[PDB]
Amino acid sequence: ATLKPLCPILEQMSRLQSHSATSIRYIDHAAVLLHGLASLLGLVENGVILFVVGCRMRQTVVTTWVLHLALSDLLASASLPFFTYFLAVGHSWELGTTFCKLHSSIFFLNMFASGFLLSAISLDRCLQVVRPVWAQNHRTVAAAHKVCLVLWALAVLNTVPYFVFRDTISRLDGRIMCYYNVLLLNPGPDRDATCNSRQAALAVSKFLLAFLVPLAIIASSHAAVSLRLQHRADLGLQHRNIFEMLRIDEGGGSGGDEAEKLFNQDVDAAVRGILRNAKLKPVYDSLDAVRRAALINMVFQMGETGVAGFTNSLRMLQQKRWDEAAVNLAKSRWYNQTPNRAKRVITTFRTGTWDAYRRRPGRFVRLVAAVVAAFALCWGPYHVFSLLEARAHANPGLRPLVWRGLPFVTSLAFFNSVANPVLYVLTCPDMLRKLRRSLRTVLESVL
Numbered sequence: 001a002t003l004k005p006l007c008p009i010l011e012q013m014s015r016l017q018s019h020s021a022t023s024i025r026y027i028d029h030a031a032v033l034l035h036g037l038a039s040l041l042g043l044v045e046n047g048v049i050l051f052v053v054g055c056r057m058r059q060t061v062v063t064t065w066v067l068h069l070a071l072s073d074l075l076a077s078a079s080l081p082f083f084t085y086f087l088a089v090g091h092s093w094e095l096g097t098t099f100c101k102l103h104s105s106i107f108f109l110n111m112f113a114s115g116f117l118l119s120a121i122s123l124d125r126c127l128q129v130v131r132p133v134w135a136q137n138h139r140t141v142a143a144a145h146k147v148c149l150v151l152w153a154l155a156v157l158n159t160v161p162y163f164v165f166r167d168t169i170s171r172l173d174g175r176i177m178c179y180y181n182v183l184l185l186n187p188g189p190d191r192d193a194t195c196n197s198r199q200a201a202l203a204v205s206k207f208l209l210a211f212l213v214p215l216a217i218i219a220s221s222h223a224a225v226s227l228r229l230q231h232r233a234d235l236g237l238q239h240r241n242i243f244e245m246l247r248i249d250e251g252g253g254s255g256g257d258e259a260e261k262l263f264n265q266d267v268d269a270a271v272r273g274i275l276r277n278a279k280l281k282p283v284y285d286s287l288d289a290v291r292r293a294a295l296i297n298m299v300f301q302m303g304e305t306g307v308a309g310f311t312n313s314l315r316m317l318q319q320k321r322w323d324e325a326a327v328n329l330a331k332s333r334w335y336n337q338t339p340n341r342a343k344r345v346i347t348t349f350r351t352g353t354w355d356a357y358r359r360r361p362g363r364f365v366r367l368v369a370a371v372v373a374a375f376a377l378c379w380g381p382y383h384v385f386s387l388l389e390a391r392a393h394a395n396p397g398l399r400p401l402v403w404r405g406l407p408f409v410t411s412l413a414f415f416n417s418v419a420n421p422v423l424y425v426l427t428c429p430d431m432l433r434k435l436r437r438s439l440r441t442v443l444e445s446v447l
């Protein structure tokens, strides 16, 4: 027999029951089937989405975001069946204490990930429009994959406190609760103070890092590209800027600090390095303006020492043998790893015609706007109530109000993992089209 000190919120919660002192648990079977089907749908929907985007669809930077975005929701749908079991038993956790920490961590892991990814998506789209020269040279899929790995690492780092402060608390009804045990580790001299501060520190930091700050970034980046496209379209209407390429002064200001701007686009800096190298100077001067700019992109992507490694490729550009140079370039490590930023360069050497990067409209815009809309509507009410239960430590009157909505708005955030794969299809015709392809392919395994 062991006794653990609890918060006044949990202590008041460990005696809540309809019938006075009994072990008979009332069961809401309507919610069991609801979350049961939600568990089934979530696993199947995100299951096929991962397959479609990840195997049948051509891999891009944007699809990589969506891929991980649907990966986090897959895990959220993997812990959900254990929440169904929780309801089926009668709101009691009967699967140990460590598993309680894991199951809970998946919820917050999904939360932070979905908040960090949606931030990454907005920032990526921001760099695509605001920083065209940098984006066309460094926005490779390999980079986008490494970003996600950092985001997951930061996500699991912010779910550790939740993993730690999760515990099994016995009710008087025989029920076993799985919730916040703030006082589980290092209780201060003032229990009521360390109970309030830690709960507030959790609810607030969660609200910021996984909701307010993302929505701030999303709304702020959305305004950046809107003004940029307006100023860009104004430049496009000008007759003199018909054949111009690699602009930087779209953001206004001056070119005095181009070598210091994050996400660098300093074209002049690259040119000075080209004229300095013995293997690049005679090749640069022999090229026309369109092909000279394509050479600047190569030293942007792999440096000047990297482009000087292609001896009998510069030998080809110097002799204006474009096609035979194209063959040699497309058979390298540089093209094999990052084909999209490479092919755009090679074709320029081939045709001598500039293909504008800031000309290409953004993709999955309908998708992200929908996913963002759902994210704000499903995690919205949650953070509201969760901030109120941290507020309810001081105000006991809010405690009954919390448990009239918190179980609802929490399951509302759970259903965000079910909504997204549907939203993927409804806003992305290619994704839906690619799905009905494989759907028809498998169904044709009867003939």
Ligand SMILES: Cc1c(CC(=O)O)c2cccnc2n1Cc1ccc(S(C)(=O)=O)cc1C(F)(F)F
Pocket (backbone or CB within 6 Å): 013, 091, 103, 104, 107, 108, 176, 177, 178, 179, 386, 406, 407, 408, 410
């Ligand atoms: C309300 C809730 C949260 C919110 C949070 O932990 O901040 C949460 C996070 C991860 C997984 N589930 C969660 N549930 C649902 C839940 C959890 C515990 C209990 S209890 C106190 O009976 O053990 C009830 C409920 C619910 F409200 F859904 F019934």
Ligand SMILES: CCCCCCCC/C=C\CCCCCCCC(=O)O
Pocket (backbone or CB within 6 Å): 043, 044, 046, 047, 048, 050, 051, 054, 055
């Ligand atoms: C129905 C429940 C089970 C769900 C099964 C999930 C199906 C997985 C689908 C294919 C994943 C293929 C991954 C290929 C993408 C590679 C990109 C990367 O390495 O991150």
